[model samples]
Target: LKWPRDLRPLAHHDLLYMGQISEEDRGDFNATLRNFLVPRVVGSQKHREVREFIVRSLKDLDWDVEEDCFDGQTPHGIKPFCNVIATLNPSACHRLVLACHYDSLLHKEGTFIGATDSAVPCAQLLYLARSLNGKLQNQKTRGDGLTLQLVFFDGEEAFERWSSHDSLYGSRHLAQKWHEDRTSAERLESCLERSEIANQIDRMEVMVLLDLLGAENPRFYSYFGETQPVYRRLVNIESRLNDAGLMELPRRRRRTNYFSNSSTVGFIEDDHIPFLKRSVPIVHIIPSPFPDVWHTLDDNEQNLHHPTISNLNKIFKAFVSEYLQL
Candidate 1:
């Protein structure tokens, strides 16, 4: 959880850099999805179970874990929510946040599993943390300007309906709290002078919020003009993976880009809204015109596409590997 810089740094140059999930890693992905593929509506028993699983999984990697717990008003009444924030290196000055909401939605049936709506993205974050454990630790030792931080927000789904007040309960709280805090311990270890106080939000470089992912042929586009470069990184990552014959996409006569080049002028109402409003540069990774089974009972394990998910796993792993310079 802590380290001091040593004089002899690891060799930065290598013959080749190819980060692909191995057979053993494939097993980890399947197990992660199984653990998180439950109906976990916020404030419910299963919800707490999933939250505990996430915290335990990250802590097993010895990451610095912090729970932001609070109570917020909802349509029904007041409900308690906790957002899990885990950083690979606490002492690094800045962080790159990869976030996904862990909560499932409730409908008349209350059995919505939300496989692609968010479970896959949450599982992907966990995979990212574990898969890049070495590179992340190297960045920690080097005091890189950017380190990996995973945030799992609760209460992303609305109780009755989607509105300004009913949705994004957890992110709204976290954004405001970080916006106002100056003496937070996490920021204190961010290597600052004793008297210099800066809001915790400033330490965050960019927040990449992942939602509604894992389906086949997901249409993700560049939304924020400032973060188009980051989006292009993903596009390049996919292209490189394809050229190397690493992608497992199905064969077809005609094809299109998974990460589109066209810019989207509009936005979706999700967990990223609050952070974006607070001046944090964001790359919202949710697919446009969401998956066919979004927010319904059919959004279960049967709907998950293993091939697409696997390719995504490789592309995303390579992206993070190159981004953090692992």
Candidate 2:
């Protein structure tokens, strides 16, 4: 199938739409950050509160929301976790997933706010959904081939310590469930003759996982060669925004490792692992050398760089708009 009409060329109308992302969206982002900057350990009341906040925000924007509740075994024991999903066009078969984890790590000395660890990235996803609501709605009306899914995962932080068995509990369960759900011939006739059920799950164009994004002088590397095109597109968007003065680049001394080549790729153990194991293409948007506040008590709102977050928001907004041809 051909790409959407809007995706073909960047016309004046498209640029106007792209420019619609502005300071108002940044205000929304900060509000979400404040709301989420709390101790949100798995299975805790704060965790539930954040989940409700996300669901309410998406519903208020008129997105179709659903929850994937499951009991997964963790080192701490069996715990109930919920994965909240909001879709712009739920009926569309092919999807583009933008995901972030909402849970904070367990801290002993002080409260772990985890602002950059994931709070800001979650807020970014929410901001994207709200900012692009009108364009997404218009696309749906025009029968656009692609849809967007924003996922806020629970139980992403390992209850005990980071281990293959403990980490990524939510993603592991959800990926397996999705694979099983799509593999069943009775559920989806299109897969009746297919040997592998994973083929259906592969229909997802790409899953972009955002993490640790609200820090000063953030540097991201092309982790996987397979997803270099996706990373390059984001870098190109950032460059264009910088050239147009719509965004600002960090100081040279502060910006040491920004978007290195794929030759120096590194793998991170994040929520994207399970989906990758299921043969899904993933675009991991995480800083190369993690922020200094990562996993520490200092990971609070005070440590976040507002301007950097604002610039990233613009770049992401432009990238999504161009990708969806909105």
Candidate 3:
């Protein structure tokens, strides 16, 4: 299991969550990743397989899963795509969307197993579910107002070159669908006031997209003002997790490489644009100056640095747990 046999029985609380995760917890993330690290380029059989993989994983945890299926006209022709969406409490009005693309870049020849471009991100979402599922279930039964939603977006990789029609088929589709829709009866199930007619698009508290991760010494910048508070929470979480294990001194670095300032960083493109354009608050966590192995054949299991992925996993579980108040 993820947590040690002892830690699994305890309730997770703020600040003290750090006390539970040790080196044993840190090393367990790699195993689940390999099953999901396969080539998942869109429209391929493997694409459907990997999509089904997380579908079953989340459903196993009692998360409500839906395959948001759609068709896209590509450089070649029409193709079918689906985004795997799982929400812990379907009735919750506000949601913290943790999103990542599952498809790899389309190669002219064989498959591209985009390990960080973002197999690690997709796999890590599953890690969050496994570690936090019980706490989330408690939140749901307690009728918490907000809940976690994991979105594994498909067909994010363009068939040919990146363009309006070629890329972001899943993002563009979901954004539009949510925009036109009125409130869900499931939402009214919470007895929420604005169960009055409104676009479901307005319900997203924030959509945080992670990409090009699983590399050593990754850096992040807060690109948007509205969501900068969420960005800073992550930075602070890293510090707490770091300082819990370190002694004061010149031993500590001047600053953390995990998250830096937003001044020079101008934010990356797509995936969240569809939702952001429609007024969704956004946190795009793609490492600036992407990993050296990005999109190359080197971006495989061999190139993925496990420690960095484990670190990201730990930080996210803590911050998300705090945000959801689990």
Candidate 4:
């Protein structure tokens, strides 16, 4: 439950059709994540269990999910890790990528669930897939020309503390792949050069990332390092959701970290940073103060807010539909 605040009620005219997942699933989701998933960290037996659980969930969603493993050096040292990249409508040209890092930070006193840190977003992505498939099958979906990449990145959390170079392993690799292809003679060259720049842009269009979206009534901050148009696009989408009567304005108070700047002051170092560095337009949906459980043991299943998940799904689904014209 949330402390009472005067969140102005909406009028009927400001309404839109937003898909919703059941709140009843919240308890089961919390139990599974807290009891089963959080105990695992990358490279541990538990990590493998978490990874398998994720793959199974995607499979249940009927996604063509695949794992992309890589041998790399972590901030701690060299380690082998994997990122799960799932897709639907893979052959389509235009692309929209949704991502969240699944790797939890390693702590001394057992592993924290990291549910809000990312698991919730993973679940929400699956929910969006369900709605997207329906729209695609009926030919009522927008972004028919676009392909969607749902990525669960690894090694985002730091073993020591938040360090720029220490994290973003999975995203860095993916970005490097795109960067290399952009510079190569591959067909991706012509595609990338046409729009963004002289890079291997291909169908890699807009990307939206979800992190710390578990706050009960969360407000997304305009992140630093993103293009103005993307920011406007996001604000417009949020406004549309409000106008559509599908979402309520976030009740959380706004706060800022040291990374805030029109250029680079308040930038967060999550999975999205690598893409932004590569010039891929991206938006991160994170609540202010990032919730109390961020990176702590308290960040277990009990902290998740079903209302947050439900509203986020509605807004994100609406945005995806609007972006793809579905």
Candidate 5:
């Protein structure tokens, strides 16, 4: 049965988060993108503010938000770290994890707003929580089959220097935890049994990581290594948007432009790398040219493409509706 509806009606023709942002609010979000949120390198005071904002935003939207702090080490050294987690319909176990690294690179020159790199994706996640909550509350489910895990990871970017060891500290830790769980399972039963989790780890259906998706009318090329079926699904998503008059053909070469044909061929350094290493099928939504603002001082609101954000939201709606239903 549907719960009594209390959430406000989503604004008109809204794809998701982008629909909530207005021209008047652009400057405010931009300031946060630049002045407040961008300057915050991982673990810095500003970074904390960014996190606080996200938590508050989620809570304001009436989400059950939690702060998950863990013992972690950056490439630089060992330190405590955190990942912000928000969950809805917790009873369901066919889980989908939508994640992004909230940490900023600690470099001076490469440090900018990190808008395209991450902030926008974070915004998208928060927006998804609110929208999905509304849907969950009002719509009837086929069954209680799926749950969504929205994770904002800390320490994805390199600290001070870019190196093999520098990137993905947070995700690496989570990956290691899975490995540890597997090792524990070997001592007793199946790897899925190693962890006390109510749901089998192997049953973690799919994971989608969002990064560099805030470009103006951005185009997502198929990232070669994804299963042909998944690639076809993504392509179908693109086609639907095109049919809906929402997007255009991506500018880069098909399937080859991103990390070569071997999806794992490119930097497997993203937050999703750990999951992929665990043999979990994953998809990363990123833009072409990766944006000139990437890891630069120029990565502020100016680099954010409204049309790109809108189109991505549209694609995500179709993708989620098809894949994330109960």
Candidate 6:
């Protein structure tokens, strides 16, 4: 596919940097996904296990990691929910957030691994953090001045049937808490005094939500006008990777294009809805028509396309590298 005429051409050096996404990184991404592919309903031991895995992985990289634990009412009952966050370049005042829900659906039938629903996205985020760690560290002294925040949200699925009151439990609670923190004069004053970025509650430049992203021949569309440019940039990056023969898929299996040019627009009620309601600029990376196995037991590792996973990892790495000017 050709680059859209409206978008500017990529410089030679930029293309070279974008091509740095590695196959080693892709292998790690798949391994992590498989590690977390069990049925991890909210408040279950498996759910806690996934959170601990993420925390441990981030700590291994020496990144600052925290768990925002909170209690909320669910259709099943009141339960504890923990949102795991890992930050790189924590002192930078400006921020970019990459988020995915780590909780799988509560299935009464058989186990639902949710590989495409989110397990893959969580793994991709970890791979991204590991891949960019050295570049981010190298920029600490140069003052490129942007912090990358990775959030793995828990309790994104409804305990029973889906409803406004039951779904998105963690995000709703966190968004409100963040709104309060961002507005607190004392918190802002303390952060400023310490030369630290304001708690990232209000300093977010953009939040990119990744979901249902590892299926074969996946198709995504720009859902928000405010984030179209960023989405287009990703599409361009995918094109560059394909043109250079760096992508993983055979030419016939590769997506004919990335972002759809159709006028149709819609939204999926995922973790980003809370932030969107608070007016945060959102770049939602979910496919327009969700994958065939979105909420079923079939949404497991067997259904995920390895080439799609590697392709997306490379595109996202390129986009983040470009966005942070790393």
TM-score of each: 0.89, 0.88, 0.88, 0.76, 0.73, 0.88
Q: What is the C-alpha RMSD of each candidate to the true structure, in Å?
A: 5.2, 4.0, 6.2, 7.7, 8.0, 4.8
C-alpha lDDT of all candidate models, in order: 0.78, 0.76, 0.77, 0.63, 0.59, 0.77
Better of 1 and 5 by lDDT: 1
| Model 6, C-alpha of 136: deviation from truth (Å) | 1.7
Write the residue-wise lDDT of candidate 4 on 145-259 in tens digits. Answer: 4556788888777777667667777888877776776432242222322343345454567677888867665655566544444545456555555444555334543321211
C-alpha-based local distance difference test score of model 2: 0.76
Which residue pairs collide, candidate 5? 216-305, 217-308, 225-263
Better of 2 and 3 by lDDT: 3
lDDT of 6 by residue, 134-180 (tens): 97677555644457888899888887888889899988888878877
Q: Which stretches of candidate 3 lie over 4 Å from their true place?
A: 1-13, 16-28, 184-197, 246-256, 264-267
Indicate the worst ten consecutive residues by lDDT in candidate 3: 1-10
**Model 2: per-residue lDDT, tens digit, 71-149?**
8887778888899988887656557789999888888887898998788899899888887789888876764456788
Candidate 6: where is the Cα deviation over 4 Å? 1-23, 183-199, 251-256, 261-263
| Model 4 worst lDDT run, 10 consecutive residues | 1-10
- By lDDT, the better pick of 2 and 5 is 2
Of candidates 4 and 2, the better by lDDT: 2
> Candidate 2: which stretches are off by over 4 Å?
1-21, 183-200, 249-258, 261-263
- How does candidate 6 fare on TM-score? 0.88
Model 6 CA lDDT for position 82: 97
Worst 10 residues of 5 by lDDT: 1-10
lDDT of candidate 3 over 169-189, digit per residue (tens): 999999999899887646444
Task: List, in order, the clash count of every candidate structure.
Answer: 0, 0, 0, 19, 3, 0
- The whole-model C-alpha lDDT of candidate 5 against the native structure comes to 0.59
